[PDB]
């Protein structure tokens, strides 16, 4: 499973996996710790710039995250790790196979709750020690005492008491003596969230049937009850800017605000996060400011701000609605296609099954941007035909990009699922272009290609026709008709002279683009699934249906190499920039490197998730691959 | 931000400091009774003398004004400067001023209020500091000359931006622009808070309710096309109606009736909201004029209901309340008058309510059905219930008579209900 | 009145001066150690200084009534009756969605002079001066052509 040429680098395009993020304050500034699968990222609350990432990938997925000043505690399986600046400093290993669920740190005590309703307490070896390491004691809540633990919390001004919140009721545990100080009355509804209020002795509890309870621990009595019918609470948080506001997040993807003083609703933010991915998994008011940070399972993190009231007097009643401030995001579902935008490791295009196309920056996450889909007005002046309700374009099946003419006109072509035309995009403006290319044979688009000069675009139809357009004006120039089955690949050499095509019928046609003549035709035994053309060496490889990669020299029109060994279909493959290697992935969950001079496999990997795409950087320093699972992109460094 | 923008903010904060003679000329020249040239020549003692006399006349009209002779119109108030006061003291000062603007809201037609208010304009500079309260209290006098004088000497807040053009303009602000100012949602929250204070203080008067109702009614009219914006108005203006119904003053209650009706016809609402709406209407219904208007509102609200349960019976608690505030004889008079509005859906729900909860009024049902013609489905529902009554309730001379009434009118439909039920 | 009492607090004795933050708790300079009950009470007072006590916690508690209308507004967020149950369509807003063309499967060569839906079956009939009777199976997604009938020299006016 360990490559001798490649090694993991990091994952691009993930901001949050849905686990509740943790907010930490250093001095005046704040930072947000978000979980990404087996590692966490730390963003600056001011600019949402990445600062640190976990040095090593955790063996198992992270379940809980808590941050106190420099130190960050990350829980996975039965181990709680302590991290500083993204480097592990110490590992806490619990003595029970039960997996940790929740994590609370107050004072010198670290409290870990396992799924078996057992709470483990650690203590600092020295009062001045930075983090707890020593094992103090174990507290277990039995079914008679209460139900499953919902979350651990510690209210302010409580000496060595831990407020254990269970589904049935709330409990108060004195960690120092390990004795149950107080037991709450049983509640009718199942509790799902707990948030300490800025007031004393009051903890906000959220039920599964839209009830928010301002339970008073000192009195052991209810103080208030907000009602949210037909909703499920997922997060609670209080505004500490001197205004008594409460933000109640819900699994449906809504965020409601209540003004406790006036017993009124300020506003509701609808569909900030997708309901399919858990809605508002976490929403936290920044301590003492009107900014609220919200997250969800849709791979996005947002910030909203309350502007000052617009009335000089009675600023309390006239509350401005929350305003979008900033955010970072990625794909909600795994990317379908990828490509390297520029010669350097500069930018990377990604299109996913969520119908969104993104331009990702390898060198700074802040630079990553979504390519907008707002259309140009037609040159003719006729009205554009489209549904009034705005919907994203279908999934991108194929993509081709060139940079010979970036900034002068369109330079990207994309093919869509079950769509009879290919759309154009402009990388410089980062928006859809103004040209649409039709196959003109009632056939779906199966292949797209661009000439190196950036003047022509080739569209391969499912009915066997190749249409050639001009990118500058989007006017059709030539149409080639040789294949009777779907064309699965098109390429043109650097000199814009010889053109090569491949189709499911198994024939590879060789064309002279200047003279528009058929130089020759080659029949292979099996249907051809994909094509990669190497312009520097004039060699192109074809992924045949019989689980082979056939390399052909366009100059002489003969098979030069044939590669065998894959046990299933070849999802994708690419040439190395120097033209010496081919890296291919297949459904059998492996990536193989093929040395073309010798025509043999020199390296092999076993990936847990099938590699749907593989792409070398033009430099050759980085290899990027995408998998059937995971919203991000896996980046590999080339040890060669 | 540029240096100029920050200085502009600094300039606004020190608007009333009177740093130099030129600044004093602008601040002291502002007046409601005197032109600029004569105003500058005047002294604080002269202005206070007229105001002290003016407040006395107001006190004769209404004793409550006499209290301010102790606080705002005292001889010691002459030496009181707002700038040198601390934050706590200013808030205390603003509460007194805000209270006065409420009393003066209804007496602006009297000349003494113009002389009583001049002291606050010159001494405490309310036209610069408490500009929002001053405009709101005088909002309904927009066609009067006094409002024109206020607009001239006043700097408009961001929310009152629509009135900017009518500053120092010969024409008074038009009724149409007044609708535009109310159209803004932030203004409605601002006005609602002000109107809430009036309800708390029993400071309301007829002219305020009339003007407040019209703008509220007109706003719904302007947003009738936009259903989404109507949805945003429901939390605010209905919440106002709840407050208005709480006022013991009958005039406030009638305004709530006027406001509530327009929403129901403008926007269909859940039967839960309509049912709750009645309970507030009937909870504090004491004045006869309110009782007349309320009953008109009750029937209109049901007429808007257009969903399953459109004519289902009233809940038990609601029915008892309605009967107490409206005896059967009263409604028989209501159905008697020829100009009665369409109320059949309510009468159907009321009619089915009688059968479920009262057995003594069954004779009243017969009288009601004759007075008002019910629509085909409503008649069918009533027959369906009375069939159930016969099987459960003992057969009575009145009960069979109600059937006999249906035998006379549309005998075939009576069989259809019987066929479906038994 | 406290529902619970913790005896550990009365016994424990903490030093204040060890850390910078706690030093502000001292009432006098001489003291250096205070028992737990006083230590908590000092923390509570200091906590209020960081977060002032708002009005809602103390003065207000929940623990025909006129305020029914106000209560129902709080619980309900969508104030419009669901039009699904109502059998009577809204006056001014029409909920209309377009589907695929009926003629897309097999186009007509003249104006559609008349249309007719079959009383029960899902068929649509089109006729025109093209002199043809084209019947379509209106399914809303495909609309294929069931049959056709050309009537020579018989313009279809209806």
């Amino acid at each position: 499973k360990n490559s001798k040429i490649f090694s993991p680098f990091r994952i691009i395009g993930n901001v949050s996996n849905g686990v509740p993020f943790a907010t930490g304050t250093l001095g005046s500034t704040f930072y947000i710790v978000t979980c990404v699968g087996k590692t966490f990222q730390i963003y600056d609350a001011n600019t949402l710039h990445l600062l640190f990432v976990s040095e090593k990938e955790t063996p198992s997925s992270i379940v809980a995250l808590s941050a106190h000043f420099h130190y960050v505690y990350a829980a996975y399986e039965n181990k709680v790790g302590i991290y500083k600046r993204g480097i592990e400093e110490h590992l806490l290993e619990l003595e029970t196979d039960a997996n940790v669920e929740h994590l609370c740190i107050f004072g010198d005590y670290l409290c870990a709750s396992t799924d078996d309703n057992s709470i483990f307490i650690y203590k600092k070896s020295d009062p001045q020690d930075k983090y707890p390491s020593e094992f103090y004691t174990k507290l277990t809540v039995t079914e008679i005492q209460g139900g499953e633990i919902v979350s651990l919390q510690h209210l302010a001004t409580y000496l060595n008491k831990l407020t254990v919140v269970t589904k049935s009721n709330v409990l108060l545990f004195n960690v120092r003596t390990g004795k149950l100080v107080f037991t709450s009355n049983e509640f009718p509804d199942q509790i799902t969230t707990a948030e300490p209020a800025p007031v004393l002795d009051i903890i906000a509890l959220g039920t599964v049937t839209g009830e928010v309870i301002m339970f008073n621990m000192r009195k052991g009595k209810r103080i208030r009850t907000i009602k949210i019918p037909q909703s499920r609470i997922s997060s609670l948080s209080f505004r500490t800017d001197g205004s008594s506001h409460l933000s109640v997040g819900t699994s449906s993807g809504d965020l409601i605000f209540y003004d406790l003083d006036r017993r009124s609703r300020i506003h509701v933010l609808k569909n900030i996060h997708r309901e399919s991915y858990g809605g508002v998994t976490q929403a936290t008011f920044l301590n003492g400011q009107p900014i609220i940070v919200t997250s969800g399972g849709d791979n996005s993190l947002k910030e909203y701000v309350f502007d000052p009231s617009l009335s000089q007097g009675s600023g309390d009643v006239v509350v401005q609605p929350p305003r979008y401030l900033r955010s970072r995001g990625g794909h909600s579902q795994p990317p379908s296609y990828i490509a390297f935008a520029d010669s350097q490791s500069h930018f990377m295009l990604s299109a996913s099954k969520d119908r969104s196309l993104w331009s990702f920056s390898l060198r700074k996450d802040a630079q990553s941007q979504e390519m907008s889909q707002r259309l140009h007005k037609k040159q003719d002046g006729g009205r554009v035909g489209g549904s009034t309700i705005k919907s994203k374009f279908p999934e991108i099946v194929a993509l081709a990009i060139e940079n010979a003419r970036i900034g002068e006109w369109e330079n990207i072509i994309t093919a869509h699922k079950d769509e009879k035309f290919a759309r154009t995009w402009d990388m410089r403006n980062k928006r859809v272009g103004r040209w649409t290319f039709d196959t003109t044979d009632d056939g779906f688009v199966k292949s797209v290609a661009m000439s190196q000069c950036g003047n022509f675009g080739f569209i391969g139809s499912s009915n066997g026709s190749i249409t050639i357009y001009n990118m500058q004006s989007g006017i059709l120039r030539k149409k080639y008709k040789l294949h009777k089955r779907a064309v699965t690949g098109i390429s043109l050499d650097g000199m814009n002279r010889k053109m090569v095509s491949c189709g499911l019928d198994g024939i590879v046609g060789f064309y002279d683009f200047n003279k528009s003549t058929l130089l020759g035709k080659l029949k292979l035994d099996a249907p051809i699934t994909a094509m990669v053309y190497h312009r520097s060496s004039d060699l192109f490889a074809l992924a045949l249906d019989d689980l082979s990669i056939v390399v052909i020299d366009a100059v002489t029109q003969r098979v030069v190499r044939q590669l065998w060994g894959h046990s299933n279909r070849i999802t994708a493959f690419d040439f190395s920039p120097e033209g010496r290697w081919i890296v291919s992935a297949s459904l059998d969950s492996t990536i193989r490197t093929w040395d073309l001079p010798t025509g043999g496999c020199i390296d092999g990997i076993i990936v847990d998730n099938v590699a749907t795409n593989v792409k070398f950087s033009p430099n050759g320093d980085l290899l990027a691959t995408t998998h059937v699972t995971g919203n991000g992109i896996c980046i590999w460094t080339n040890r060669a | 931000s540029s240096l100029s923008d920050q200085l502009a903010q600094v300039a606004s904060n020190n608007a009333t400091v009177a740093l130099d003679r030129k600044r004093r000329q602008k601040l002291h020249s502002a007046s409601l009774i005197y032109n600029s040239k004569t105003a500058a020549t005047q002294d604080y003692d002269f202005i206070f003398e007229n105001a002290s006399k003016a407040l006395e006349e107001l006190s004769q009209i209404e004793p409550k004004f006499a209290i301010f002779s102790r606080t705002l119109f005292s001889e010691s108030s002459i030496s009181l400067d707002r700038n040198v006061q601390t934050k706590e003291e200013i808030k205390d000062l603003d509460n007194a001023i805000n209270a006065y603007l409420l009393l003066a809201s209804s007496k602006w037609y009297l000349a003494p209020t113009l002389h009583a208010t001049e002291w606050l304009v010159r001494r405490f500079q309310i036209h610069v500091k408490n500009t929002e309260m001053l405009l709101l209290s005088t909002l309904n006098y927009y066609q009067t000359p006094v409002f024109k004088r206020i607009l001239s000497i006043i700097k408009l807040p961001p929310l009152f931006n629509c009135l900017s053009n009518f500053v120092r303009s010969e024409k008074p602000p038009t009724a149409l622009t007044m609708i535009k100012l109310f159209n803004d949602m932030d203004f409605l929250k601002l006005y609602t808070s002000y109107l809430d204070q009036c309800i708390k203080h029993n400071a309301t008067y007829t002219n305020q309710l009339l003007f407040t109702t019209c703008c509220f009614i007109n706003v719904v009219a302007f947003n009738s096309n936009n259903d989404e914006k109507l949805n945003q108005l429901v939390p605010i203006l209905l919440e106002i109606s709840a407050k208005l119904l709480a006022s013991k003053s009958k005039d406030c209650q009638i305004a709530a009736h006027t406001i509530l009706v327009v929403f129901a016809t403008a926007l269909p609402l859940k039967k839960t909201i309509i049912l709750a709406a009645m309970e507030t209407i009937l909870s504090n219904l004491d004045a006869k004029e309110a009782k007349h208007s309320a009953l008109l509102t009750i029937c209109k609200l049901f007429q808007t209901l257009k969903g399953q349960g459109n004519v289902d019976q009233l809940p038990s608690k609601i029915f008892k309340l309605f009967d107490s505030k409206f005896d059967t004889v009263s409604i028989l008079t209501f159905l008697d008058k020829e100009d009665k509005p369409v109320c059949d859906k309510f009468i159907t729900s009321y009619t089915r309510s009688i059968a479920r909860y009262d057995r003594s009024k069954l004779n009243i049902i017969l009288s009601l059905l004759k007075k008002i013609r019910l629509e085909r489905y409503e008649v069918r529902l009533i027959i369906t219930d009375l069939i159930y009554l016969s099987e459960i309730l003992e057969d009575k001379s009145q009960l069979v008579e109600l059937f006999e009434y249906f035998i006379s009118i549309n005998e075939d439909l009576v069989l259809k209900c019987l066929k479906s039920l038994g | 009145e406290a529902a619970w009492i913790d005896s550990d607090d009365e016994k424990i004795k903490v030093p204040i001066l060890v850390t910078n933050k706690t030093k502000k708790l001292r009432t006098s300079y001489n003291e250096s150690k205070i028992n737990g009950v006083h230590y908590i009470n000092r923390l509570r007072s200091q906590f209020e200084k960081i977060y002032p006590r708002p009005k809602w916690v103390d003065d207000e508690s929940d623990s025909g009534d006129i305020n029914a209308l106000t209560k129902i507004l709080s619980t309900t967020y969508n104030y419009k009756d669901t039009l699904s149950n109502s059998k009577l369509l809204p006056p001014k807003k029409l909920d209309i969605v377009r589907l695929k063309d009926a003629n897309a499967s097999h186009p007509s060569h003249s104006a559609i002079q008349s249309l007719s839906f079959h009383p029960s079956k899902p068929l649509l009939l089109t006729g025109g001066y093209d002199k043809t009777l084209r019947i379509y199976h209106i399914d809303g997604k495909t609309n294929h052509l069931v049959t056709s009938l050309h009537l020579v020299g018989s313009p279809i006016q209806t």
Partner: peptide, 27 residues
Amino acid sequence: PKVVREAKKVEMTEARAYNADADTAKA
């Protein structure tokens, strides 16, 4: 003119927060 709705720049302000470290004590 209708009400001007400008989005003013919002910059962070230092805010004091309670430290839970004082909560723990040892006998």
